[PDB]
Design a protein around this ligand. Sequence first.
Ligand SMILES: O=c1[nH]cnc2c([C@@H]3N[C@H](CO)[C@@H](O)[C@H]3O)c[nH]c12
Ligand SMILES: O=c1[nH]cnc2c([C@@H]3N[C@H](CO)[C@@H](O)[C@H]3O)c[nH]c12
Ligand SMILES: O=c1[nH]cnc2c([C@@H]3N[C@H](CO)[C@@H](O)[C@H]3O)c[nH]c12
Lengths: 282, 282, 282
Amino acid sequence: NGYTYEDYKNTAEWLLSHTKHRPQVAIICGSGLGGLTDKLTQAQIFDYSEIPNFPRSTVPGHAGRLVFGFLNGRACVMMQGRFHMYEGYPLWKVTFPVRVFHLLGVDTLVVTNAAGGLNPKFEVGDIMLIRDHINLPGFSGQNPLRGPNDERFGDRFPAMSDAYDRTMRQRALSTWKQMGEQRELQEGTYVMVAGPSFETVAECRVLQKLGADAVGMSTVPEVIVARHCGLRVFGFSLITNKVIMDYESLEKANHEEVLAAGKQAAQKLEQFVSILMASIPL
Amino acid sequence: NGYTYEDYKNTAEWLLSHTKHRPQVAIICGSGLGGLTDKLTQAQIFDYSEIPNFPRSTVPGHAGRLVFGFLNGRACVMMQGRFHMYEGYPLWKVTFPVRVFHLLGVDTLVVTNAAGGLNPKFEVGDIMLIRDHINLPGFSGQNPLRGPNDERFGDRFPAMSDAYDRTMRQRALSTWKQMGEQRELQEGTYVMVAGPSFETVAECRVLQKLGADAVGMSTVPEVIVARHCGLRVFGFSLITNKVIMDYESLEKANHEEVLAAGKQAAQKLEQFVSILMASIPL
Amino acid sequence: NGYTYEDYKNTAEWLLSHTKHRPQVAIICGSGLGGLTDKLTQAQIFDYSEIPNFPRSTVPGHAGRLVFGFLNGRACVMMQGRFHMYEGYPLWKVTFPVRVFHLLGVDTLVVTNAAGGLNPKFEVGDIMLIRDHINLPGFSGQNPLRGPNDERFGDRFPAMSDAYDRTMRQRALSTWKQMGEQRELQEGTYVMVAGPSFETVAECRVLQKLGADAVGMSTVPEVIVARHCGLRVFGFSLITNKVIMDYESLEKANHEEVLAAGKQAAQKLEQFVSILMASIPL
Ligand SMILES: O=c1[nH]cnc2c([C@@H]3N[C@H](CO)[C@@H](O)[C@H]3O)c[nH]c12
Ligand SMILES: O=c1[nH]cnc2c([C@@H]3N[C@H](CO)[C@@H](O)[C@H]3O)c[nH]c12
Ligand SMILES: O=c1[nH]cnc2c([C@@H]3N[C@H](CO)[C@@H](O)[C@H]3O)c[nH]c12
């Protein structure tokens, strides 16, 4: 880990003295869900590039910003554009923001991402609540906590079985009723794989048999660092595609389609998140 | 990744100006299958050590060469001796040749390797066509594409479900009939593990339950880089041994036996490959 | 690997000329099992920090020592405090001692660790003999042998299916009868995960379905290096907790509880080990 405790502190303090805003809820917008930034009011934007110690983006979409503001009654901070392991970032960089949020005073982290559906029942457009995750990179060593533990943040061996807030998932199921939507609010296990290439059929079968419902290339690292911090954690996946499970099918998962789905069910996710803010304690 | 786009270009151009040969098909010979180099005509040999930017071998068998020539009607380029992750090479070195081949004008990659049989039906000497693969190292982060994507080679999120050419696998099943062999041409899923040590019984059971048919310590990285490039891909495994699946058995998988099998079914593989060249488009 | 063959030699020779002791059996004490050091006689202690080339501890418990002596008729060497991958150590450091032991003249390695129980039959306090292991980090590349192989230690592709000594496991089952204990001596498969955070429910389910009986964050690397060396290997896990397998349960795995169990069944393990020494050849 290239960051000392001081680096996290210096970054937090810089931010605190450059905005009057004091966030409680941190929101990490996944792929094609950065729209949420438009719904904040009293919005103050910061480019990642101007924030000391922040991972400087390579050349994905060149858009990397921290937006502070209010979202339906909650003092928020949103990450529009997140860091991925597949881009070459070591996990201690990918999750660097999460620890900054904590020192800013945040106590809740909402994570969203786009993911392939592994559960045969899921459909494009569906929203899946995350009850649990399978951290494959973590089993092998790619765990954001690897390295000396800093007592100031958390314990050496933090538990994850209770990572996804029970209370918030229920209130999420509740709130969805108010939406009175056509489809139900899905719920299941999220499995992380490093990517950046998509799964083969054999690989999809594996992920299925392991009990995963959706597959993505992010999130788990941030969740683990959050929990290690004491942050409350809630999140969901936008099923942008149904991974191929048979060899007969003549279709391929492509970024084009993912973004497309990200465009359709776009504001559908944003609403849910904005409303759910009221369901978050203080 | 220590290689810039320029490095790949400089290597390709050096090769292009040092041989009149212009390959279409690149062939990566696995363990004990380097014999194929003898069947090329108008053969021109290059030691890896003389090629700019090529990974310089440590001390496996000290034989590392690029052989250009013609194989049964096709302008080829063969790798006699390939790079492995278990030797300490980062995947961007292991797969460095594949991207060079692409800039040389190659459009097809044939990969062969030796592997343990996981499917109880397979037998030593058997040849298994590869219909799909399970990339375990990739799930955790060891994917040759990790790092910034260069648009010039391919897309950020390339698909792999259609990695192994459907057309060529059928023509391979076809051609094998002409061989009129005793045993049938096997076909299945290849699972990659990093090695260099062999699987325990419990591990073999795992690989079996994941749906793999053969286990090896290579290939998948080259395949992914090829596909990312647009290369057509065909390949197979020589089942040099039946991995131990029970604790009662009193035998151990050893390099001696693998090489031995590599010696027996030696020319049997070479023929198939040489003939199959005619089955490859242009 | 940052160590040349010379480094291992220099460390062994330094040790040999700083103690008259000449160990035959090396014992690696897991978490809360370092008590075994008290049972050695003619004991000579060495802090890891004073041993050339030894990984210098960060700040776990600040206790890192090599204790030479005699344990019930056997010339031993014990590691009180072992190195873990989750602390940031590359596997070639974690396993550096094992190769030193070999050059000191050791021919047997006994490994103990604390682990969560995955098999529903196991109970806290139980002792599980290790018949086999599933090396998940190894499948992805985190194998202590990665890098050039040194013929002087072992072969390039060492087998592991026979890693856990058949003879010693039987004599262990035998000896346990003499204990005439309430509970039986358990036996099963150990799965290694990198940690340092604990498994989620979904992850526990995975490990279960893979056929593991106990999960830990160590051991496998040392075992592989031992075997590669020719060392006889015997070991066991102290089931300090039953991993959560359902979402209803309202309990969390914590270091507190692990240490607690380490304190209870403490001397129960020590005895077994001390007695078992007599069961070890010469
Ligand atoms: O089927 C899938 N497999 C793996 N990742 C994704 C994704 C997510 N979307 C992104 C690529 O569009 C990538 O960052 C990944 O996290 C969507 N569908 C899938
Ligand atoms: O049972 C097996 N498990 C894993 N790899 C191999 C191999 C391949 N052969 C090589 C070792 O002889 C090694 O490079 C690996 O890629 C043969 N049999 C097996
Ligand atoms: O349930 C478990 N999962 C993973 N590791 C452990 C351990 C072992 N104990 C240590 C943490 O107390 C850690 O080093 C790990 O190796 C006990 N219980 C479990």
